[PDB]
Amino acid sequence: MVLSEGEWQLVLHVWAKVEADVAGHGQDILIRLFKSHPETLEKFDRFKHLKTEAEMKASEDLKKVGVTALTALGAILKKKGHHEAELKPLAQSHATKHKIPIKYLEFISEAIIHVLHSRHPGDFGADAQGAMNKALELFRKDIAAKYKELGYQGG
Numbered sequence: 517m518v519l520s521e522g523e524w525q526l527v528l529h530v531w532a533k534v535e536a537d538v539a540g541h542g543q544d545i546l547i548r549l550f551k552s553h554p555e556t557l558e559k560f561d562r563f564k565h566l567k568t569e570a571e572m573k574a575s576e577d578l579k580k581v582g583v584t585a586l587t588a589l590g591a592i593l594k595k596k597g598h599h600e601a602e603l604k605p606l607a608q609s610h611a612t613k614h615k616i617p618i619k620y621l622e623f624i625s626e627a628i629i630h631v632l633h634s635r636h637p638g639d640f641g642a643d644a645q646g647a648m649n650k651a652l653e654l655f656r657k658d659i660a661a662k663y664k665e666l667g668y669q670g671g
Protein backbone atom coordinates (compact mmCIF):
# COMPACT_ATOMS: atom_id res chain seq x y z
CA MET A 517 0.00 0.00 0.00
CA VAL A 518 0.84 3.73 -0.39
CA LEU A 519 3.98 2.91 -2.38
CA SER A 520 3.55 1.14 -5.69
CA GLU A 521 4.32 -2.56 -5.91
CA GLY A 522 7.38 -1.72 -8.01
CA GLU A 523 8.60 0.67 -5.32
CA TRP A 524 8.14 -1.98 -2.62
CA GLN A 525 10.10 -4.46 -4.75
CA LEU A 526 13.01 -2.01 -4.93
CA VAL A 527 12.88 -1.51 -1.16
CA LEU A 528 12.84 -5.25 -0.46
CA HIS A 529 15.52 -5.92 -3.09
CA VAL A 530 18.06 -3.69 -1.36
CA TRP A 531 16.87 -4.91 2.05
CA ALA A 532 17.84 -8.43 0.99
CA LYS A 533 21.38 -7.06 0.56
CA VAL A 534 21.22 -5.68 4.11
CA GLU A 535 20.17 -9.12 5.36
CA ALA A 536 23.42 -10.61 4.05
CA ASP A 537 25.19 -8.76 6.89
CA VAL A 538 22.73 -7.17 9.31
CA ALA A 539 25.35 -6.73 12.05
CA GLY A 540 27.80 -4.93 9.79
CA HIS A 541 25.11 -2.67 8.33
CA GLY A 542 23.83 -1.82 11.81
CA GLN A 543 27.29 -0.91 13.07
CA ASP A 544 27.97 1.35 10.11
CA ILE A 545 24.56 3.00 10.36
CA LEU A 546 24.95 3.79 14.06
CA ILE A 547 28.54 4.99 13.57
CA ARG A 548 27.39 7.25 10.70
CA LEU A 549 24.53 8.54 12.85
CA PHE A 550 26.80 9.41 15.78
CA LYS A 551 29.39 11.12 13.55
CA SER A 552 26.86 13.17 11.56
CA HIS A 553 24.59 14.07 14.49
CA PRO A 554 26.63 13.69 17.69
CA GLU A 555 23.74 14.71 19.97
CA THR A 556 22.13 11.32 19.24
CA LEU A 557 24.89 9.49 21.14
CA GLU A 558 23.53 11.01 24.36
CA LYS A 559 20.57 8.60 24.15
CA PHE A 560 22.86 5.55 24.61
CA ASP A 561 24.18 5.49 28.18
CA ARG A 562 26.31 2.39 27.65
CA PHE A 563 28.13 3.75 24.55
CA LYS A 564 29.54 6.97 26.04
CA HIS A 565 32.95 5.37 26.69
CA LEU A 566 33.25 4.32 23.02
CA LYS A 567 35.45 7.17 21.81
CA THR A 568 36.71 5.97 18.40
CA GLU A 569 35.14 4.28 15.39
CA ALA A 570 37.25 1.18 16.05
CA GLU A 571 35.92 1.02 19.63
CA MET A 572 32.38 1.30 18.32
CA LYS A 573 33.02 -1.50 15.80
CA ALA A 574 34.47 -3.72 18.55
CA SER A 575 31.51 -3.29 20.90
CA GLU A 576 29.25 -6.32 20.94
CA ASP A 577 26.68 -4.21 22.80
CA LEU A 578 26.53 -1.65 19.98
CA LYS A 579 26.39 -4.43 17.36
CA LYS A 580 23.48 -6.11 19.13
CA VAL A 581 21.58 -2.82 19.45
CA GLY A 582 22.02 -2.23 15.71
CA VAL A 583 20.78 -5.71 14.78
CA THR A 584 17.74 -5.27 17.02
CA ALA A 585 16.83 -1.99 15.31
CA LEU A 586 17.42 -3.23 11.76
CA THR A 587 15.48 -6.44 12.48
CA ALA A 588 12.47 -4.41 13.59
CA LEU A 589 12.76 -2.09 10.58
CA GLY A 590 13.01 -5.02 8.17
CA ALA A 591 9.88 -6.62 9.61
CA ILE A 592 8.04 -3.31 9.13
CA LEU A 593 9.28 -2.83 5.55
CA LYS A 594 8.16 -6.36 4.64
CA LYS A 595 4.58 -5.42 5.60
CA LYS A 596 4.57 -2.96 2.66
CA GLY A 597 2.76 -0.30 4.69
CA HIS A 598 0.46 -2.68 6.61
CA HIS A 599 2.46 -2.08 9.77
CA GLU A 600 0.14 -0.61 12.44
CA ALA A 601 0.57 -3.66 14.70
CA GLU A 602 4.36 -3.43 14.47
CA LEU A 603 4.58 0.36 15.02
CA LYS A 604 2.47 0.61 18.18
CA PRO A 605 5.03 -1.04 20.52
CA LEU A 606 7.90 0.80 18.82
CA ALA A 607 6.16 4.16 19.29
CA GLN A 608 5.43 3.39 22.93
CA SER A 609 9.04 2.63 23.83
CA HIS A 610 10.59 5.39 21.76
CA ALA A 611 8.14 8.10 22.78
CA THR A 612 7.84 7.29 26.49
CA LYS A 613 11.03 5.42 27.50
CA HIS A 614 13.93 6.37 25.21
CA LYS A 615 12.42 9.80 24.36
CA ILE A 616 13.48 9.88 20.70
CA PRO A 617 12.30 12.93 18.71
CA ILE A 618 11.00 12.29 15.21
CA LYS A 619 13.94 14.40 14.00
CA TYR A 620 16.30 11.67 15.26
CA LEU A 621 14.37 9.15 13.14
CA GLU A 622 15.09 11.47 10.19
CA PHE A 623 18.78 11.42 11.17
CA ILE A 624 18.93 7.63 11.28
CA SER A 625 17.00 7.45 7.98
CA GLU A 626 19.73 9.61 6.41
CA ALA A 627 22.37 7.25 7.80
CA ILE A 628 20.50 4.22 6.43
CA ILE A 629 20.39 5.78 2.95
CA HIS A 630 24.08 6.70 3.14
CA VAL A 631 25.25 3.23 4.16
CA LEU A 632 23.06 1.41 1.63
CA HIS A 633 24.37 3.59 -1.21
CA SER A 634 27.95 3.26 0.04
CA ARG A 635 27.75 -0.54 0.07
CA HIS A 636 25.33 -1.36 -2.77
CA PRO A 637 25.43 1.39 -5.43
CA GLY A 638 24.70 -1.14 -8.19
CA ASP A 639 21.49 -2.16 -6.39
CA PHE A 640 20.52 1.27 -4.99
CA GLY A 641 20.17 3.74 -7.83
CA ALA A 642 17.92 6.76 -8.03
CA ASP A 643 14.64 4.82 -8.34
CA ALA A 644 15.54 2.55 -5.41
CA GLN A 645 16.68 5.51 -3.31
CA GLY A 646 13.38 7.25 -3.95
CA ALA A 647 11.44 4.12 -3.03
CA MET A 648 13.40 3.65 0.20
CA ASN A 649 12.97 7.34 1.01
CA LYS A 650 9.19 6.96 0.60
CA ALA A 651 9.12 3.83 2.75
CA LEU A 652 11.09 5.47 5.55
CA GLU A 653 8.97 8.63 5.24
CA LEU A 654 5.82 6.52 5.68
CA PHE A 655 7.34 4.80 8.71
CA ARG A 656 8.19 8.18 10.26
CA LYS A 657 4.79 9.70 9.45
CA ASP A 658 2.92 6.78 10.98
CA ILE A 659 5.07 6.56 14.09
CA ALA A 660 4.64 10.34 14.59
CA ALA A 661 0.87 9.83 14.57
CA LYS A 662 1.27 7.07 17.18
CA TYR A 663 3.47 9.36 19.30
CA LYS A 664 0.66 11.93 19.37
CA GLU A 665 -1.95 9.28 20.19
CA LEU A 666 0.15 8.48 23.29
CA GLY A 667 0.44 12.15 24.24
CA TYR A 668 3.90 12.95 22.79
CA GLN A 669 4.38 15.47 20.00
CA GLY A 670 7.90 14.16 19.36
CA GLY A 671 9.38 17.56 18.54
Ligand code: HEM
Nearest residue numbers: 556559560581584585588589606609610614616620621624
Ligand atom coordinates in the same frame (compact mmCIF):
# COMPACT_ATOMS: atom_id res chain seq x y z
C1 HEM B 1 14.66 2.83 12.14
C2 HEM B 1 14.54 3.42 13.33
C3 HEM B 1 14.55 2.62 14.66
C4 HEM B 1 14.12 1.37 14.91
C5 HEM B 1 13.41 0.38 13.97
C6 HEM B 1 14.39 1.10 16.30
C7 HEM B 1 14.08 -0.07 16.94
C8 HEM B 1 14.39 -0.36 18.25
C9 HEM B 1 14.08 -1.59 18.93
C10 HEM B 1 13.32 -2.77 18.29
C11 HEM B 1 14.54 -1.50 20.18
C12 HEM B 1 14.42 -2.58 21.28
C13 HEM B 1 13.01 -2.60 21.88
C14 HEM B 1 12.55 -1.23 22.31
O1 HEM B 1 13.08 -0.71 23.33
O2 HEM B 1 11.65 -0.65 21.65
C15 HEM B 1 15.18 -0.21 20.32
C16 HEM B 1 15.80 0.27 21.46
C17 HEM B 1 16.38 1.51 21.62
N1 HEM B 1 16.31 2.53 20.69
FE1 HEM B 1 15.56 2.38 18.81
N2 HEM B 1 15.01 2.19 16.87
C18 HEM B 1 15.12 3.15 15.88
C19 HEM B 1 15.68 4.39 16.03
C20 HEM B 1 16.28 4.88 17.16
C21 HEM B 1 17.01 6.13 17.28
C22 HEM B 1 17.25 7.10 16.10
C23 HEM B 1 17.43 6.24 18.55
C24 HEM B 1 18.28 7.34 19.23
C25 HEM B 1 18.88 8.35 18.61
C26 HEM B 1 16.97 5.07 19.26
C27 HEM B 1 17.18 4.82 20.59
C28 HEM B 1 17.00 3.60 21.21
C29 HEM B 1 17.52 3.24 22.51
C30 HEM B 1 18.35 4.16 23.43
C31 HEM B 1 17.14 1.98 22.76
C32 HEM B 1 17.49 1.16 24.02
C33 HEM B 1 18.83 0.47 23.70
C34 HEM B 1 19.31 -0.43 24.83
O3 HEM B 1 19.77 0.10 25.87
O4 HEM B 1 19.23 -1.67 24.68
N3 HEM B 1 16.26 4.26 18.40
N4 HEM B 1 15.06 0.47 19.12
